[PDB]
Write a protein that binds this ligand. Structure first.
Ligand SMILES: O=C(O)c1ccccc1-c1c2ccc(=O)cc-2oc2cc(O)ccc12
Ligand SMILES: O=C(O)CCC(=O)C(=O)O
Ligand SMILES: [Mn+2]
Length: 432
């Protein structure tokens, strides 16, 4: 395989014909004032230690990301990639003033890039021969900030198909975005084939290493845009230069099951089956109908694994730059603890003498997959909290395996390990 850069005569026509949905707006087109502001914002964020490498999970292995990052965006919004849910430090849509100022800066960059994107999307439609679709596909709700110092990496991976040289980030799609949504990236580098000292973004067609890839040089303050279905039909990578680089990558995160309001509402739905006169350990349920019980136990899993474990696995890195999620997370944990109460109440009822066996077995069938998944996912998460790299990484830089409690812990109604309970319930369902 081979690739094309601006040095190749064929670059220009290949871009024009096979990448009309890829747009580059060079530093020129962006005001010197905005450049100054976002570049300074990058630097304060970096100095206040707001960017971290994430311990992600990909095809079974636990890996530290080469880039350190932070997610900034709409209050209560989250973004899930590589099995890790990132939580926004909020930006002032309708904390220390410095970080607050930085987030404010990245909101107005967001506004600017949003405008640029709509324009580009409008011009693309005109070329191609609705109005609501365009604006919704440009309505960026988060940005993921990235930083890498390549001189800090002992060995960088070679780009494997086109001879593009050292990769800072491997070939991928930006995951979990709204369908056909645009992506906009502000790139900030500190200042035969592609120039090794300069940062590039590379593109290829999915499934395809025969059509030469493009490598687009990125100088200080250059912006690039993936429009419409480009992010889906193509992969991209980031090719490392010799100097450090920041990027701000603005996305329309698909957040239908990914906001604080969404998850609080799911919890409230679950607790509708609980007599709510008073908050104490004496949990009693309004109904034992299979469909209501299954739903309750599913919500229980959702808040435990998608929210609590995700949040705490990331070493409590937030109250550092924002306490915003601290109270929400306390609240979600209290809701989850009530639901541990619910599971116990269901279990009590299963054991009640005078419960017909047919009704018991209908209850078992309703809840068994949820409890099985709860056991398995607890194993998987506990594994993830030790692994190798978690072991290797310093004591300061370790994942927290919360919520977790000992067999002796009398504050919790059920054991953390559900193996016996699951076995027993399963056994009962095979009884004759
Ligand atoms: O880019 C990498 O090689 C990498 C290294 C360690 C951890 C994650 C990644 C990696 C990504 C890192 C950040 C990001 O925004 C996207 C990434 O996508 C990847 C896709 C892969 O197939 C394989 C790897 C990645
Ligand atoms: O920085 C870029 O150019 C794209 C960002 C990126 O590839 C990522 O880390 O998701
Ligand atoms: Mn990307």
């Amino acid at each position: 395989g081979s690739h094309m850069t601006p040095k190749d005569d064929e670059f220009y026509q290949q871009w024009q014909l096979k990448y009309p949905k890829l747009i580059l707006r060079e530093a020129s087109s962006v005001s010197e004032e905005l450049h100054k502001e976002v570049q300074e914002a990058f630097l304060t964020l970096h100095k206040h230690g707001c960017l971290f490498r994430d311990l992600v999970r990909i095809q079974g292995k636990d890996l530290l990301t080469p880039v350190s990052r932070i997610l900034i965006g709409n209050p209560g919004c989250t973004y899930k990639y590589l099995n890790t849910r990132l939580f926004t430090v909020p930006w002032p849509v309708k904390t220390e003033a410095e970080i607050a100022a930085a987030c404010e800066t990245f909101l107005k960059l967001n506004d600017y890039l949003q405008i640029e994107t709509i324009q580009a999307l409008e011009e693309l439609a005109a070329k191609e021969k609705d109005e609501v679709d365009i604006k919704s596909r440009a309505a960026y709700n988060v940005t993921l900030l990235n930083f890498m110092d390549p001189q800090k990496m002992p060995y960088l991976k070679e780009e494997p198909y086109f001879g593009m040289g050292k990769m800072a980030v491997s070939w991928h799609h930006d995951e979990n975005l709204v369908d056909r949504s645009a992506v906009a990236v502000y790139s900030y580098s500190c200042e035969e084939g592609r120039d090794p000292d300069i940062w590039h973004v590379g593109f290829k067609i999915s499934w395809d290493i025969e059509t030469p890839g493009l490598a687009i040089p990125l100088h200080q303050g250059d912006c690039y845009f993936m429009l419409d279905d480009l992010n889906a039909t193509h992969q991209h990578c980031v090719l490392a230069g010799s100097q450090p680089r920041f990027s701000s990558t603005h996305r329309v995160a698909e957040c239908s099951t990914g906001t604080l309001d969404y998850i609080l509402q799911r919890c409230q739905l679950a607790l509708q089956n609980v007599c709510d006169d008073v908050d104490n350990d004496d949990v009693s349920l309004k109904s034992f109908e299979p469909a209501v019980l299954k739903q309750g136990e599913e919500i229980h899993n959702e808040v435990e694994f998608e929210w609590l474990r995700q949040f705490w696995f990331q070493g409590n890195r937030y109250r550092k730059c924002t306490d915003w999620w601290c109270q929400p997370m306390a609240q979600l944990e209290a809701l989850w603890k009530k639901m541990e109460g619910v599971t116990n109440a269901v279990l009590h009822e299963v054991k009640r003498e005078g419960l017909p066996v047919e009704q018991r077995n209908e209850i078992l069938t309703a809840i068994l997959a949820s409890l099985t998944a709860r056991q398995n996912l607890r194993r998987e998460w506990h594994a993830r909290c030790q692994s190798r790299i978690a072991r290797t990484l310093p004591a300061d830089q370790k994942p927290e395996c919360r919520p977790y409690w000992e067999k002796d812990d009398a504050s919790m109604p059920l054991p953390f390990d559900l193996t016996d309970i699951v076995s027993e319930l399963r056994g009962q369902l095979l009884e004759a």
